[PDB]
Structure formats: C-alpha cells, structure tokens
Amino acid sequence: MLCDSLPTASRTAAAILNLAQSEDVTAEALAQLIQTDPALTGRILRFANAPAQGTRRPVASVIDAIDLVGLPAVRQFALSLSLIDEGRCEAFDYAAYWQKSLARAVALQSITAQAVAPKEAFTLGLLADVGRLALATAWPEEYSECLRKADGEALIALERERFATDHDELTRMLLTDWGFPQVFIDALQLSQQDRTGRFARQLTLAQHIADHRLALSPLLRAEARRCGLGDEDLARLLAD
Ligand code: NA
C-alpha cells in the first residue's frame, strides 16, 4: 500500500525497540543493529540528509547519522517500529532479501577496506537493491503477480510494464531521496550493467560473493583479481 513504510524483520525490530527503550542505550549498540536493516537505515539517512538540502556533505553510514542527529532522535525511530504492521507481498522472499542484503554489505565493506570509505560502502551494499523491498511494500499483490511469472531481465521489463518503473531505478531514486553521495549512485547504476568504475566493480563482486554465500567459481575468481584483491581475501570473504 502506498505511503506504507519499508518493513523491518520481526526479531530485529524487537531488539532495536527494546534496546532503545532503555535509558542506558549507546549509539554504538544502536548503530550495530540498525545498520543491518535497509528500512531503518533509509529512514535515518533521509532524516539526517534531507534537512541539509545539500548545504554540506551527506552522512552515508548509520553511526555517522546517529552522532549528527543525536541519539534521542534515533531512539524515536526505534520507538515507532511497532506501527509498521515480514510483509504482505506473498511471493517476495523477505528473509532471502534480508540475508543477501546484509552479506552484500559486509562483503563490499571488506572489499573497499583494501581499495572509498568502508563504513559507507557497507551502506551502499546493504541498500543496493532496496527498490525490490519498496515494490513489495507499495504493491504486494501486483508484485506477487510479477515475481510469480518473471525473473531477472524479464522481471525488470515486467515491473516496467506493471509499475512504470523497475527495482534498479527505484533503488536509485530512493538513494537520491535519502541524500546518498552522487558517486555511489553512479557506481550502482554502472554495476547494474556490465573512480566510479572501480567501485561499481567491487559492488558487483560483493553481490556475487553474496549470491554464493547464500547457496570458487572461474570468472568470480578473475573478478576478484580485476579489483586487485586476489587471494586468500576471496576465500576469507566466503567463510563466515
Ligand atoms: Na495493517
């Protein structure tokens, strides 16, 4: 349904709410949890960046946003999680989405730690396909129809046909609305189709690591090397 907030996983919303309810809550402890959730991460960043309107460099990590807007503000984002009624889109594999998203973020953080700010690349990774969550949330029944029929490139075309947008473009407009740095958005768009170029490549790697962790290939072995990584980094990235 339109104007419905992106949802958070149940257990995770429970943790975040309880944590925040305490008066002895820390920013580090709140950030650790929040940053595993695309929805909350997106609301906070929009909250921290939108007011600025471009008057300064944007935050691109939760911890950075917490310290900017203050911990009492962020408690409140936690305190209302309850309201967001782990979603009605029947065909959408929410758990898979949440796992893949987190693994991609962890991977991309590792990758850039040895090659752009890791904490921020973590965030881009996490949110790199948030347009899927948004479709499932705005139009559950319609999106189910789509997911049940198509997949991959057909899916994008079917989404375009049914919603006058796709999940890749949604991701990008959301990230732009949330004040993400232009370079991240370009990198993402680039990666959505085989400097900005380097990062786009690390993102696709991260996505690929993610794909495989939720399931050592030839090309992926070479992708590792295109990024200047090589081993055993690539292995470490596939083992917890
Ligand atoms: Na409801």
CATH number (domain holding residue 213): 1.10.3210.10
Q: Following DSSP, what letter does each residue of the chain receive, concatenated?
A: -TTPPPP--HHHHHHHHHHHHSSS--HHHHHHHHTT-HHHHHHHHHHHHTTTTTSSPPP-SHHHHHHHH-HHHHHHHHHTGGG----S-TT--HHHHHHHHHHHHHHHHHHHHT---HHHHHHHHHHTTTHHHHHHHH-HHHHHHHHHH--THHHHHHHHHHHSS-HHHHHHHHHHHTT--HHHHHHHHHHT---HHHHHHHHHHHHHHHHHHT---HHHHHHHHHTT--TTHHHHTT--
Q: What distance in Å separates the CA atoms of residue 24 and residue 217, rounded to the nearest whole number?
A: 47
Non-local (6+) Cβ contacts of 72 within 8 A are none
Q: What distance in Å separates the CA atoms of residue 147 and residue 89, rounded to the nearest whole number?
A: 10
Contact (Cβ atoms closer than 8 angstroms) between residue 138 and residue 130: no
Contact (Cβ atoms closer than 8 angstroms) between residue 175 and residue 184: yes
**What one-letter code names the amino acid at 99?**
Q
What's the 5 CA to ligand 1 centre distance in angstroms? 11
Place of tokens 């752009």: 116
Contact (Cβ atoms closer than 8 angstroms) between residue 65 and residue 157: no
* Residues in the chain preceding a C-to-N separation beyond 2.5 angstroms (breaks): 85, 115, 194, 215
Q: What distance in Å separates the CA atoms of residue 76 and residue 21, rounded to the nearest whole number?
A: 9
Contact (Cβ atoms closer than 8 angstroms) between residue 207 and residue 191: yes
Q: For residue 100, give its domain range.
A: 2-240
What's the 1 CA to ligand 1 centre distance in angstroms? 9
Q: What distance in Å separates the CA atoms of residue 139 and residue 164, rounded to the nearest whole number?
A: 13
- Total domains in the fold of the chain: 1
Method for this entry: X-ray
4, 66, 94, 231 from 80: Cα distances, Å: 13, 17, 21, 44
Kindly provide the resolution of this structure in angstroms, with one decimal.
2.4
What's the 200 CA to ligand 1 centre distance in angstroms? 38
Task: Single out the residue of 6, 26, 15, 30 nearest to residue 178, CA to CA.
Answer: 6
Q: Which long-range contacts (CB under 8 A, 24 or more apart) does 214-221 make?
A: 214/96, 214/99, 214/100, 214/103
Q: What distance in Å separates the CA atoms of residue 193 and residue 213, rounded to the nearest whole number?
A: 22
Q: Which long-range contacts (CB under 8 A, 24 or more apart) does 20-23 make?
A: 20/74, 20/75, 20/78, 20/79, 21/78, 21/79
What's the 101 CA to ligand 1 centre distance in angstroms? 25
Output the CA angle 106-111-114, nearest 5 degrees.
130
